[PDB]
Write a protein that binds this DNA or RNA. Structure first.
Lengths: 72, 77, 630, 227, 81
DNA sequence: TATATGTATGTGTGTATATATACACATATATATATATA
DNA sequence: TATATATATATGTGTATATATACACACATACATATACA
C-alpha cells in the first residue's frame, strides 16, 4: 500500500525570508474573491498607502471548511 | 510510464443489455444517446412493461453516452 | 497563536444605502439592523439599497474606497477562559448542548463592548461565537425547517408566491431556469441559482414515494422516477413547469392572500410570513432533513382522517361535534389519524408505540425463485439492490439477482443456490413482528417521526403527536375567515356609497352642464355644492392590503375623481340599467355577509365547509389524471 | 509590477549578455534587436468575412467596401421614417379636428339621452363625424404605410365615445387647440425636409452624428460608467 | 431583450436573471451557460477588450487586461445595466 | 558537423454540444471492527 | 457469546468550485531527415 503543489495560490515576494514575519496571507473563500483581491492589491500608484504583493499572498478556502472538532 | 499511469486507465455511462455477447448477440441494438438526460428518457421508455407490450426492452437493447460532440478522425490520422 | 495574535479578518459592508445627492452612503453589517433602520423610515423612494453577497459584487469606485483604508479595517482575535466550552457547544459532537442553547435568540451587544471593539480593533472569540455563529445557526434553522401552518420552507414559499404571480395572465409553461430567474428577481432571493433550480425541480415531482403528495406545479418533461429516488431528472435547460391552477385556487384562496403578514426585503414586500391553507397541509406530506441542532421527519396522514376531523370540528350537525371540542379542551384522541397508504400496495402494522411498513414477496419452490413485488415506504430500488448485494451473509444463498421493474411498479427477481430454502429459516429466525424472508430480504422499516417545526415570529416548536399540530393549526383559519368577512363588509358598504352617486350624476349631467366650467377646481367646487360625497376612488376600486382602520380612515378624504373619469360610453341607458342591477346585487351580497358574520359555532362556518368540498374534488380530479389535470 | 490597467514588466539579465543579444538576434529595419528578443511586435492581419441580409456569406477586401455598402441602407431608412411620420401626422390632425368640435357641440348634442352605443354611432355619423380606427392612429406599431392608409379610415366612433368627462373642460380644449397647432407646424416641417438635397433627411442624420459623437465622448470620460 | 427589459426603470439585474429574461422573451433555443458567457463578454470594458463601445454598463468584477478578460466573476455576483 | 526540410504537435478566439465536485446541518440505521472471557 | 470502540449512509436547504467535444487559421515550439560534407 505504501508502494503537484498548491492550487489557486499566489505567494508573496517575501515569504519565508529575512522579512518573513511581516507578510500576510489573505485567505479568500473562492475565486471571484481572489479576482477582487487581485484587482485591489495592484493599485500601483493610485494607492501609495495600500498593500501589494510585496507583503501579501492569496489562497482559496474551497467553499466551506471541514471541521476538525469532530473528526479527531 | 504506462504502468505508473495504468491505474487511471483500468467511468462511462453504460447499461448492458441482458443478451450482449452471447448466443443471440446479433439480435441486439445499442441506443447510443448523446448525454445523461437522454438516457433518462430512454430508460423511461424501455421500461413500459405492459403499456407497451410490442415495444423493446433491456433484453436486447443497451445504452451508452456519446459524450457531447464526437471527435473527428479525418483530421487526426 | 490565537493567544499571541495570528488570526485576523477584514470587515466589509453587507448593505450600502445611497441617498440621492450625497456622496457618502450609510453602511450596514447585519440584515436585521437594516430592517430595523428601514421600518422606522417614512418613505424610501429616494434611496437605493444594495445587497452584497460575496466580495465580487463591489465595483471599482468602492473597492478603491475599501482599499484606501485597508489597515483600518483588519481586526485581531483574542480569547479568554470563557471560550473553550463555547467551541465545544457550537462545534462538538453532541447536540443536546446545541439544542438547549439554540432555543433562545441572539443577545445584543453592549455599548462598552462595541466601543472597545470599534476603538482598539480586537475581537473576543466568545463574543464572536455568541453573536455571529449563533445568528447563522438560527438563520439556518429558519431556512431548513418547515413552518407548521403551510408546511413549507422559506425557499418553497418564495417559489409558490412567485409562481402564483408568474402564471397569472396565461398558464404557459416555461423552462426551469427561466422561472428561477423570475422568482429570484421578483421575490428578492439572495442566494445562488443552482439550489433554487433544484428546489423548483423537486417541488414539482410526482411519483410513488415522492416527497410531495400534492405538488404546487405540473411538471412537463422528464422529472425522475422511483428507481433512483428522483435523482435522475433532466437538466433545467430541458424540462418545464406550469402552475396546477385549480388546486392552488381552492387550497390557497386568493382573497386570503391580502390579509397575511408579509416578509419585507430591502424595503418592499416579498412573500407572506406564512400561508394558511384550507386543510392542514403540514401533516399531509413526507419529509426528512437535518438542520442545526434539530431534525425534521414526517410521514403523511390519511386524507379521509383529516377530512373527518376538520368536518367534525366545523360542521354543526355532525354527531362528533361537542365531543371533539371536549377532546380539544383535554387533549385526548377520539377519531383515528392513520398513516397514508395511497400509492402503496404493502401493509402497515402497529406494534407498541410505532408503525411498521412491510414489503411483499412471492415464494416459489418449483424454481427456487422469490419474486419481490414491492419495497417499503420511500425505499429506492437500486439502493435496495446494492444493499442486498453488499451483505456477505446474504450473498451465500443467491446465484443471481435481476431487475424487471417498470417505471412505476417494483418487480425484482432473485435466484437461489440449489436446495437453500431450508437453511434460511434456521439462520434468519422468525419473530412475531417479521417473517424469516422479510428478515432475509430487508422488507420492513419503522416509521419514526421527528415533529420539529418553526412557528410564527420565528423559533423552534416541537410537538409530540400529529393531533397537537392539527389543534394548533385550526384557530388561525378561524380568525382568518372572520377577518375576510369583516373586510368584505366594509368594502361593500363603501362601494354602495360610491356607485349610488354615479347613478345620480348620470341622471343630472344634463341639468348640471359640466362643459361650462373652467378646470377641476371649479368643477369640484360645483360638485361639492350639490351633495356629492368626496371619495377615495383608488382605495375603493383596489383595496390591496389596507386594514379596516386604514380603509375607513382614508376613504372619506379624497376628491371627485370617481365621477370625473366617467367615459361618455357609460352615460347611456343600458349602462344605467347595468349599474342599478349591480348595486342591487351588491346590497344583496351585503345582507348575506352580515348574516354570515353571526352563525354557529363561529363566523364563517359554512364557507369553510364549501371550501373543504372544493379542495376534495380538486384532489380527486388530480389523483385521477396522474396529476396532469387534463 | 503591473497595475490594474497599466503594464510594467521587469526582466533581469545575467552579466555580459546584452552584446550577445545584439550580435545574435539581428536587426532589420522593420524590427529592433530588443523587440526581436522580447516579442514586441505583431501584424494587424484581417479576414473581412461577414454575413449579408437575407442570408449568406459575403467577403470584402478593404474597410472602404464595407462603408460604401453600409451607407444606402441608412439613407433609405431615413426616407421611409419620414414618409411614415408624414402619414401619421395627417391622420392625427384628422382625428383631433373632430374631437374638438365634438366638445364644442356635445352640450346640445346630448348623448346622455340615447339608449345604447349603436343609436349614438348612428347620430354621430348623421352629423359628419369621420369613422376612425382609434387603436391604430394613436399607436402605429408595425404597420406599413399601405396598411396605415388602408385600414385606419375604416373603424368606428370609439375615439369619440371613450372620452372622459375630465376632457370636457375649457383648459383641455385650449390644450387640444395648441396641440393641433404644434402638429400642423410639425407636418409643415416634415414636408419641408422631405424635399431637401442630396437625399430626404440629410440634416437629421447630421444631428444624429453630433449626438452619437458627444455621447461617445461623455462615455470615454467616465470610464464607460456614465456618471 | 435589454431594450425591452430595462424600459420602465434602468434598475440593475444579475447576469443569470437577465439571461432568463432574454431567453424567455426573445425565444432563445439553446443552453444557459453560453448565453451568460455572451452577456458577460458583451458587458466587459478594459484596454484591449473586443468591444470599444459596449451595449451595457457592467457593475462588479468584469475581468482585466492581464488574464484576457477570463478572470471575471460568476454570473450570480456581477450585474449589468 | 553544420544545415535546411519536411514532418509532427499545440494553444487561441466565439458559439455551440454534453457532463463533473467540495462543504454545513440532525438523527436513525448499519456493516463490520474490536476486548477479554476463556 | 459477549461489551465496547471507531468510521460510515441518507434526507432538505444552503456554501463554494470542476470538465469533455466542434469549428478556422496565423503562430509558436519540436524534431529529423537528409546532403554537402567532415
Amino acid at each position: 500500500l505504501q508502494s503537484v503543489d498548491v492550487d489557486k495560490y499566489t505567494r508573496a515576494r517575501n515569504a519565508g525570508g529575512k522579512r518573513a514575519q511581516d507578510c500576510m496571507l489573505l485567505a479568500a473563500e473562492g475565486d471571484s474573491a481572489l479576482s477582487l483581491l487581485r484587482t485591489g492589491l495592484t493599485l500601483g500608484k493610485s494607492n501609495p498607502s495600500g498593500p501589494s504583493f510585496d507583503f501579501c499572498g492569496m489562497i482559496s478556502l474551497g467553499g466551506v471548511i471541514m471541521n476538525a472538532c469532530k473528526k479527531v | 510510464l504506462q504502468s505508473i499511469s495504468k491505474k487511471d486507465n483500468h467511468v462511462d455511462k453504460y447499461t448492458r443489455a441482458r443478451n450482449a455477447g452471447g448466443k443471440r448477440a446479433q439480435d441486439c441494438m445499442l441506443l447510443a444517446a448523446e448525454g445523461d438526460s437522454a438516457l433518462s428518457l430512454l430508460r423511461t421508455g424501455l421500461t413500459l412493461g405492459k403499456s407497451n407490450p410490442s415495444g423493446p426492452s433491456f433484453d436486447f437493447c443497451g445504452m451508452i453516452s456519446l459524450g457531447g460532440v464526437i471527435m473527428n478522425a479525418c483530421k487526426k490520422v | 497563536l490565537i493567544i499571541h495574535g495570528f488570526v485576523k479578518r477584514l470587515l466589509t459592508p453587507l448593505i450600502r444605502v445611497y441617498e440621492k445627492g450625497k456622496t457618502m452612503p450609510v453602511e450596514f453589517y447585519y440584515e436585521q439592523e437594516f430592517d430595523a433602520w428601514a421600518k422606522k423610515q417614512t418613505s424610501l423612494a429616494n434611496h437605493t439599497v444594495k445587497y452584497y453577497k460575496g466580495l465580487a459584487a463591489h465595483d471599482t469606485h468602492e473597492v478603491k474606497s475599501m482599499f484606501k483604508h485597508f489597515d483600518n479595517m483588519v481586526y485581531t482575535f483574542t480569547l479568554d477562559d470563557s471560550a473553550k466550552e463555547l467551541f465545544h457547544i457550537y462545534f462538538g459532537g453532541e447536540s443536546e448542548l446545541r439544542k438547549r442553547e439554540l432555543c433562545t435568540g441572539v443577545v445584543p451587544l453592549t455599548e462598552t463592548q462595541t466601543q472597545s471593539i470599534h476603538s482598539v480593533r480586537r475581537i473576543p472569540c466568545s463574543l464572536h461565537l455568541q453573536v455571529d455563529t449563533k445568528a447563522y445557526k438560527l438563520d439556518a434553522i429558519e431556512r431548513q425547517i418547515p413552518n407548521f401552518l403551510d408546511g413549507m420552507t422559506r425557499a418553497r414559499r418564495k417559489i409558490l408566491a412567485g409562481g402564483v404571480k408568474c402564471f397569472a395572465s396565461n398558464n404557459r409553461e416555461r423552462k426551469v431556469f427561466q422561472f428561477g430567474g423570475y422568482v429570484a428577481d421578483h421575490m428578492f432571493y439572495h442566494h445562488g441559482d443552482m439550489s433554487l433550480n433544484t428546489s423548483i425541480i423537486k417541488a414539482a415531482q410526482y411519483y410513488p414515494g415522492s416527497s410531495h403528495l400534492y405538488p404546487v406545479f405540473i411538471g412537463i418533461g422528464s422529472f425522475g422516477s422511483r428507481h433512483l429516488g428522483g435523482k435522475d431528472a433532466g437538466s433545467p435547460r430541458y424540462i418545464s413547469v406550469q402552475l396546477a391552477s385549480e388546486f392552488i385556487k381552492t387550497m390557497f384562496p386568493a382573497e386570503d392572500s391580502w390579509l397575511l403578514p408579509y416578509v419585507f426585503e430591502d424595503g418592499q414586500r416579498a412573500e407572506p410570513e406564512y400561508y394558511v391553507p384550507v386543510l392542514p397541509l403540514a401533516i399531509m406530506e413526507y419529509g426528512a432533513n437535518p438542520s442545526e441542532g434539530w431534525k425534521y421527519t414526517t410521514w403523511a396522514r390519511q386524507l379521509e382522517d383529516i377530512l373527518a376531523l376538520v368536518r367534525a370540528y366545523v360542521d354543526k350537525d355532525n354527531p362528533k361535534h361537542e365531543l371533539l371540542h371536549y377532546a380539544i379542551k383535554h387533549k385526548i384522541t377520539i377519531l383515528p389519524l392513520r398513516p397514508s397508504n395511497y400509492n402503496f400496495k404493502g401493509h402497515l402494522k402497529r406494534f407498541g408505540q410505532y408503525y411498521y411498513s412491510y414489503g411483499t414477496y412471492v415464494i416459489s419452490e418449483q424454481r427456487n425463485i422469490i419474486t419481490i413485488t414491492e419495497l417499503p415506504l420511500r425505499v429506492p430500488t437500486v439502493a435496495y439492490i446494492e444493499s442486498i448485494k453488499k451483505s456477505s451473509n446474504r450473498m451465500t444463498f443467491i446465484e443471481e439477482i435481476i431487475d424487471y421493474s417498470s417505471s412505476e411498479t417494483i418487480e425484482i427477481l432473485v435466484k437461489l443456490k440449489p436446495n437453500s430454502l431450508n437453511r434460511i429459516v434456521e439462520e434468519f429466525k422468525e419473530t412475531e413482528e417479521q417473517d424469516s424472508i422479510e428478515n432475509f430480504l430487508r422488507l420492513r422499516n419503522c416509521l419514526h417521526s421527528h415533529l420539529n417545526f418553526v412557528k410564527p415570529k420565528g423559533g423552534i416548536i416541537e410537538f409530540n403527536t400529529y393531533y397537537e399540530i392539527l389543534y394548533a393549526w385550526l384557530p388561525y383559519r378561524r380568525e382568518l375567515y372572520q377577518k375576510r368577512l369583516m373586510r368584505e363588509h366594509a368594502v361593500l358598504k363603501l362601494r354602495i356609497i360610491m356607485e349610488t352617486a354615479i347613478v345620480r350624476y348620470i341622471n343630472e349631467s344634463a341639468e348640471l352642464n359640466l362643459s361650462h366650467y373652467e378646470d377641476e377646481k371649479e368643477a369640484s367646487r360645483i360638485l361639492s355644492e350639490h351633495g356629492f360625497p368626496p371619495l377615495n376612488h383608488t382605495l375603493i376600486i383596489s383595496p390591496e392590503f389596507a386594514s379596516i382602520e386604514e380603509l375607513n380612515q382614508k376613504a372619506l378624504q379624497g376628491c371627485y375623481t370617481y365621477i370625473l373619469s366617467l367615459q361618455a360610453r357609460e352615460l347611456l341607458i343600458a349602462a344605467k340599467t347595468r349599474r342599478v342591477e349591480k348595486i342591487k346585487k351588491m346590497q344583496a351580497r351585503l345582507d348575506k355577509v352580515e348574516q354570515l358574520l353571526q352563525e354557529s359555532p363561529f363566523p364563517g362556518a359554512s364557507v369553510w365547509l364549501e371550501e373543504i368540498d372544493a379542495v376534495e374534488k380538486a384532489i380527486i380530479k388530480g389523483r385521477n389524471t396522474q396529476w396532469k389535470f387534463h
